[PDB]
Amino acid sequence: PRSLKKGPFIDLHLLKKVEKAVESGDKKPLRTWSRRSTIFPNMIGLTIAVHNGRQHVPVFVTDEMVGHKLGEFAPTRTYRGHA
Amino acid sequence: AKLHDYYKDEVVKKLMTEFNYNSVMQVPRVEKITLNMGVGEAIADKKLLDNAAADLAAISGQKPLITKARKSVAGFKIRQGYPIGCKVTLRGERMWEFFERLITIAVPRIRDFRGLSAKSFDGRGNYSMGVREQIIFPEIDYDKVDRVRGLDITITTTAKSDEEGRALLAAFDFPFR
Amino acid sequence: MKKDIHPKYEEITASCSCGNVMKIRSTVGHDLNLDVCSKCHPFFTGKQRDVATGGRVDRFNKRFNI
Amino acid sequence: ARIAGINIPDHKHAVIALTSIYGVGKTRSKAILAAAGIAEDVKISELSEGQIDTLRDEVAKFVVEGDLRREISMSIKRLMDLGCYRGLRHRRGLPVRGQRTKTNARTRKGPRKPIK
RNA sequence: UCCUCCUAAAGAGUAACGGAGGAGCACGAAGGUUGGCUAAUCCUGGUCGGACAUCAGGAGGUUAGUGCAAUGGCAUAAGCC
RNA sequence: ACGACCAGGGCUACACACGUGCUACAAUGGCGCAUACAAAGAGAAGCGACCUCGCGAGAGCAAGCGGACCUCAUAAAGUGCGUCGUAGUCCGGAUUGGAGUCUGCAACUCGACUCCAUGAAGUCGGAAUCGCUAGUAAUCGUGGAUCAGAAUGCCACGGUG
Numbered sequence: 001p002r003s004l005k006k007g008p009f010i011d012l013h014l015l016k017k018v019e020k021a022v023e024s025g026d027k028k029p030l031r032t033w034s035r036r037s038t039i040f041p042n043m044i045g046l047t048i049a050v051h052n053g054r055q056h057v058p059v060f061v062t063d064e065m066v067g068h069k070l071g072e073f074a075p076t077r078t079y080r081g082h083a
Numbered sequence: 084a085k086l087h088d089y090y091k092d093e094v095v096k097k098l099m100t101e102f103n104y105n106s107v108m109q110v111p112r113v114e115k116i117t118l119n120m121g122v123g124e125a126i127a128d129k130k131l132l133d134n135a136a137a138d139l140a141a142i143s144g145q146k147p148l149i150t151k152a153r154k155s156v157a158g159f160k161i162r163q164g165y166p167i168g169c170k171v172t173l174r175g176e177r178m179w180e181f182f183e184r185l186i187t188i189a190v191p192r193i194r195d196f197r198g199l200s201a202k203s204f205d206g207r208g209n210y211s212m213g214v215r216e217q218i219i220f221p222e223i224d225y226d227k228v229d230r231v232r233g234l235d236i237t238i239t240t241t242a243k244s245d246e247e248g249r250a251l252l253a254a255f256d257f258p259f260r
Numbered sequence: 261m262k263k264d265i266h267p268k269y270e271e272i273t274a275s276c277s278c279g280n281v282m283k284i285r286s287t288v289g290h291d292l293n294l295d296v297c298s299k300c301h302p303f304f305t306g307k308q309r310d311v312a313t314g315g316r317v318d319r320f321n322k323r324f325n326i
Numbered sequence: 327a328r329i330a331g332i333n334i335p336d337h338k339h340a341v342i343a344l345t346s347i348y349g350v351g352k353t354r355s356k357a358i359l360a361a362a363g364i365a366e367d368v369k370i371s372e373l374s375e376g377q378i379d380t381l382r383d384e385v386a387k388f389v390v391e392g393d394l395r396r397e398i399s400m401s402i403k404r405l406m407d408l409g410c411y412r413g414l415r416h417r418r419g420l421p422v423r424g425q426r427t428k429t430n431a432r433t434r435k436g437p438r439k440p441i442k
Numbered sequence: 443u444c445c446u447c448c449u450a451a452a453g454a455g456u457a458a459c460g461g462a463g464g465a466g467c468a469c470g471a472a473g474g475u476u477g478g479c480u481a482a483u484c485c486u487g488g489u490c491g492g493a494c495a496u497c498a499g500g501a502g503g504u505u506a507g508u509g510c511a512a513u514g515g516c517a518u519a520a521g522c523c
Numbered sequence: 524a525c526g527a528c529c530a531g532g533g534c535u536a537c538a539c540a541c542g543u544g545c546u547a548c549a550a551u552g553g554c555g556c557a558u559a560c561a562a563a564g565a566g567a568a569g570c571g572a573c574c575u576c577g578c579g580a581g582a583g584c585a586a587g588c589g590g591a592c593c594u595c596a597u598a599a600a601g602u603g604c605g606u607c608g609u610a611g612u613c614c615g616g617a618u619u620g621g622a623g624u625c626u627g628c629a630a631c632u633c634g635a636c637u638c639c640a641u642g643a644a645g646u647c648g649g650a651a652u653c654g655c656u657a658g659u660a661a662u663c664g665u666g667g668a669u670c671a672g673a674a675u676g677c678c679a680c681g682g683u684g
């Protein structure tokens with residue numbers, strides 16, 4: 001993981017969008033390519049559509065989803081099985 | 084008869100108040116405790132039954148009644164009459180002293196004990212529980228045994244409703260939750 | 261009860277780490293030293309702590325300051 | 327010879343027989359006996375019962391048999407319920423930590439499953 | 443050849459290459475007696491234990507049981523120790 | 524547009540089949556303490572002592588060095604003592620959980636390392652098959668290239684033999 005002395009990580013263009021959608025109070029799905037941004041506690045309750053390589057899958061943000069990054073909830077490989 | 088002495092003075096005074104019974108005979112009371120070991124694997128050999136009955140005779144100090152199959156079923160490969168389990172009925176003073184040793188010693192000796200269920204009272208007050216492992220009783224020596232048995236405890240009481248047996252065991256601080 | 265068929269059932273003393281001296285009737289014969297009794301088992305204090313869910317937001321805010 | 331719920335063998339030495347507890351290892355067993363003042367080369371045999379009472383209190387400081395299995399299952403089921411990538415690996419039976427699944431994933435996948 | 447039911451027409455009996463099933467044994471206790479006991483099934487609860495073993499409660503009331511076919515009996519049990 | 528630019532993904536997927544390897548299945552060993560003996564290399568956007576802090580990977584301050592000077596850098600196998608005493612074990616380390624460090628705009632897919640916990644398979648391998656004639660095989664550590672980081676590969680080096 002990242003060092004504690006650097007703190008967390010989030011894109012600036014994402015962090016400005018989180019700051020806007022909190023104050024504006026809109027529940028539009030925010031499409032986002034920041035698969036590497038740690039989710040913050042002020043993001044809880046928002047539909048944010050993380051990219052997966054091909055499209056944007058919407059992720060509702062839960063209490064337990066804080067200490068992870070957005071790419072974990074957008075799986076990039078589709079696999080169903082061989083048989 | 085320590086808990087039987089504890090029953091007659093303080094449990095009866097407790098239940099008569101919180102239920103407003105007309106008579107003192109209207110109070111619940113425990114009647115018998117049944118100690119079954121369903122040993123379905125004894126059809127291979129009698130010695131597993133003969134030693135499991137020996138173990139349950141050490142838990143409660145009575146020689147167990149070896150139970151048999153009421154009828155024949157083919158899913159378990161048994162015929163009507165095969166010795167298939169053992170039971171002990173405990174009444175009187177021997178009921179209370181096992182009941183003392185149960186809730187004070189053996190229930191704390193359960194690995195990862197976290198309580199009982201209050202949903203095990205058979206609709207009519209009679210409580211039944213089942214233990215995973217006979218080593219929770221201190222009667223069993225750990226080195227001398229080889230096989231982990233299991234038994235189940237069944238407290239048959241005179242409570243009419245379902246909650247009245249639940250309140251009865253709670254007067255004996257029975258660790259529900 | 262019958263006479264011969266039953267095992268020996270004798271009153272012994274069972275002591276514990278909290279010093280709860282308790283005399284019971286038993287089939288052990290020798291004296292018994294316990295580890296936990298119903299008086300000293302952590303069912304009424306210890307098991308309440310042992311759920312320990314923890315907060316995800318509280319884990320986040322502890323690691324630094326903004 | 328009965329610590330934290332389970333029994334512990336007497337013929338072994340002190341540090342080794344402690345490691346039968348689900349939650350301690352060779353490191354933490356040295357941490358237990360140093361806090362109890364008990365030498366590590368002695369057995370669980372020829373211990374005073376006061377020393378074993380000292381031993382039970384030191385083990386009770388940490389997370390052990392009944393607590394730890396609940397915490398481990400809680401952490402896995404936390405990943406199960408979120409549906410993250412680590413949750414999907416935990417429930418497809420595939421390796422979580424980013425190992426190869428093309429070859430040599432036999433610990434998570436069990437023995438080989440022949441194409442029938 | 444023998445047993446049971448129907449045909450058989452409310453006593454007995456009653457035919458057909460009429461309709462359906464069995465028997466050519468078993469048991470030294472599965473006999474005698476005294477004493478005692480009461481099923482099937484289902485519901486709920488309970489370690490392994492599962493549709494189904496054993497245990498505890500309740501419904502049920504013989505829908506079970508009878509060494510074997512069917513019919514008639516069987517609780518005073520002829521059923522079960 | 525079959526040319527060009529960017530973000531994200533992929534090249535790391537996974538019922539399976541094969542090659543080449545690494546670590547093992549232990550007692551000619553595991554472990555703990557003590558202790559002896561190397562060679563060959565690299566180093567300036569680098570090597571980084573000493574001291575301090577951290578269980579630890581590391582962090583801080585910071586000399587010395589373009590290097591027979593200083594640094595990477597204490598060789599390990601060995602020996603000496605103690606320990607385990609044949610067990611799936613004080614063997615084996617997979618897997619997984621928790622906590623971290625460092626690199627880098629950034630370690631989710633998808634890095635390495637550390638700590639605590641976890642303790643799979645495996646008890647010497649079917650038919651088959653490979654390497655090797657002397658400092659060789661076998662075994663034991665060491666270094667370099669590539670490289671921000673990232674080898675069990677590759678290329679070198681000596682020990683025992």
Ligand SMILES: [Mg+2]
Pocket residue numbers: 345346347348349350351
């Ligand atoms: Mg352990």
Ligand SMILES: [Mg+2]
Pocket residue numbers: 351
């Ligand atoms: Mg470890």
Ligand SMILES: [Mg+2]
Pocket residue numbers: none
């Ligand atoms: Mg007639």
Ligand SMILES: [Mg+2]
Pocket residue numbers: none
């Ligand atoms: Mg007539």
Ligand SMILES: [Mg+2]
Pocket residue numbers: 472
């Ligand atoms: Mg008869």
Ligand SMILES: [Mg+2]
Pocket residue numbers: none
């Ligand atoms: Mg009679």
Ligand SMILES: [Mg+2]
Pocket residue numbers: none
């Ligand atoms: Mg690109």
Ligand SMILES: [Mg+2]
Pocket residue numbers: none
């Ligand atoms: Mg490739």
Ligand SMILES: [Mg+2]
Pocket residue numbers: 565
């Ligand atoms: Mg280099």
Ligand SMILES: [Mg+2]
Pocket residue numbers: none
């Ligand atoms: Mg230090």
Ligand SMILES: [Mg+2]
Pocket residue numbers: none
């Ligand atoms: Mg050595």
Ligand SMILES: [Mg+2]
Pocket residue numbers: none
């Ligand atoms: Mg040695």
Ligand SMILES: [Mg+2]
Pocket residue numbers: none
């Ligand atoms: Mg090991």
Ligand SMILES: [Mg+2]
Pocket residue numbers: none
């Ligand atoms: Mg095996």
Ligand SMILES: [Mg+2]
Pocket residue numbers: 646
């Ligand atoms: Mg072995």
Ligand SMILES: [Mg+2]
Pocket residue numbers: none
């Ligand atoms: Mg040659």
